């Protein structure tokens, strides 16, 4: 043993305020590599494999559109999650600026997840969460939609308690209202934040203000139909919270229609959502069909890029609270500040952390 687009990539590199450097971390088998794979196929329609375990990290840099269309350049450091390989994570954790911690919906937090939130807060990065693998609550565990709410709330509160345990300053508490957490199913092509879901609600239905809407969904707000005005506790209807009735129950019904009643009720329900599908594409099996419908309805990936763009340092802002730790002097006279400029100019101070051997 990209013609008119890599130039565009170059100009994006040159802006240095349209790029985000993020590390994709979490526990073992919690969804990272499949996230990345389905994502590169979103962009390109163009030892390990036998192991089923990733050993060494891999970086990807790709151009992603947000919920407004503005393209970004994304630096994604896909790490391994086996607690024995935490070495690789440290590497990414230096040369990146934020962390997307992938948590499992069915398991929650375990060893490596808490240890990685520790390693991430002690290196003063940004911290975002993707509660991934949510179908394991609907199809596998078979949970009433309200107890799905309970479990999601629990995971978020526990990760919140730990991130408070290792960090003194109550600068950030995570909850999807702030745009901290996506909800995901890597393989079933669904990733959404309250922002993205409320914008979907608006774009297909009437003109409702998606931002003020998204401020109302998570977290014990109820809604009374007659007044059409969300309230804190005052339904005695024995009804669900805004979250359940508006985001989960519709998602339960989407899935239950796809896997249960694919032959009879599915064309009707698909009409009621706006998705049209060929005869040929309704002859798929249930997993490819489910993923295809969910992709056709949920759009590509906006929840993630939205949450990240909204809470990434953007290396231009970036560098300054970093060279405290990285640099041995930090800022004294010449180079600390020069780097803090992050200007493509002069000093050229780079940090190399990995060496990927060429096969040959």
């Amino acid at each position: 043993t990209t013609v008119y687009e890599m130039d565009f990539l170059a100009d994006l590199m040159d802006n240095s305020e349209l790029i985000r450097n993020v590390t994709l971390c979490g526990h073992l088998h919690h969804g990272k590599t499949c996230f990345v794979d389905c994502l590169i196929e979103q962009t390109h329609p163009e030892t390990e494999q036998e192991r089923g375990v990733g050993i060494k990290s891999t970086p990807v840099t790709v151009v992603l559109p947000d919920t407004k269309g503005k393209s970004y350049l994304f630096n994604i450091m896909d790490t391994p999650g086996h607690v024995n390989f935490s070495d690789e994570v440290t590497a990414g954790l230096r040369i990146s600026d934020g962390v997307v911690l992938f948590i499992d919906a069915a398991e929650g937090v375990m060893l490596n997840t808490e240890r990685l939130i520790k390693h991430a807060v002690q290196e003063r990065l940004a911290v975002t969460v993707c509660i991934n693998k949510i179908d394991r609550l609907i199809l596998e565990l078979k949970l009433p939609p309200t107890d799905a709410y309970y479990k999601l709330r629990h995971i978020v509160d526990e990760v919140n308690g730990l991130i408070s345990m290792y960090s003194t300053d109550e600068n950030l508490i995570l909850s999807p209202l702030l745009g901290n957490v996506c909800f995901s199913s890597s393989q079933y092509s669904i990733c959404f934040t309250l922002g993205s879901f409320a914008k979907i609600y608006a774009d297909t239905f009437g003109d409702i203000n998606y931002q003020e809407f998204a401020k109302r969904l998570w977290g014990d707000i109820y809604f009374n139909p007659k007044t059409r005005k969300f309230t804190k506790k005052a339904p005695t209807s024995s009804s669900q919270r805004s979250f359940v009735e508006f985001i989960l129950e519709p998602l339960y019904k989407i899935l239950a229609q796809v896997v249960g009643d694919v032959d009879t009720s599915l064309p009707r329900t698909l009409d009621e959502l706006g998705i049209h599908l060929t005869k040929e594409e309704l002859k798929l099996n249930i997993r490819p069909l489910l993923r295809l419908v969910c992709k056709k309805f949920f759009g590509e990936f906006t929840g993630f890029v939205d949450m990240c763009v909204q809470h990434i340092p953007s290396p231009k802002v970036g560098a300054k609270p970093k060279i405290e730790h990285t640099y041995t002097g930090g800022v004294d006279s010449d180079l600390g500040e020069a780097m803090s400029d992050c200007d493509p100019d002069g000093p050229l101070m780079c940090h190399t952390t990995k060496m990927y051997s060429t096969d040959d």
Binding site: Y4, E5, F8, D11, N15, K68, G69, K70
Partner: protein, 81 residues
């Protein structure tokens, strides 16, 4: 939304310029833009009806008050039309 409005919003952050309804020009970096064309620009250069050129910190103008808009050589690259 239209293809031009999508290009304009996507041009946010890049270097752009515009020619207003009153005959004045304003270039700058992309600050903010929306589907209503209400354009916010920052650190721009401004050229009046005679040609007086000067600097502006940040400004926000209604959509209908702009006539044309010049973008960099990037946007030309949805090629389906």
């Amino acid at each position: 939304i239209g293809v031009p409005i999508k290009v304009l919003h996507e041009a946010e952050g890049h270097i752009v310029t515009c020619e207003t309804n009153t005959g004045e020009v304003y270039r700058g970096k992309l600050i903010e833009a929306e589907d209503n064309m209400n354009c916010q620009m920052s650190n721009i250069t401004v050229t009046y009806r005679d040609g007086r050129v000067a600097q502006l910190e940040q400004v926000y103008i209604r959509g209908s008050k702009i006539r044309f808009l010049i973008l960099p050589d990037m946007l030309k690259n949805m090629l389906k039309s």
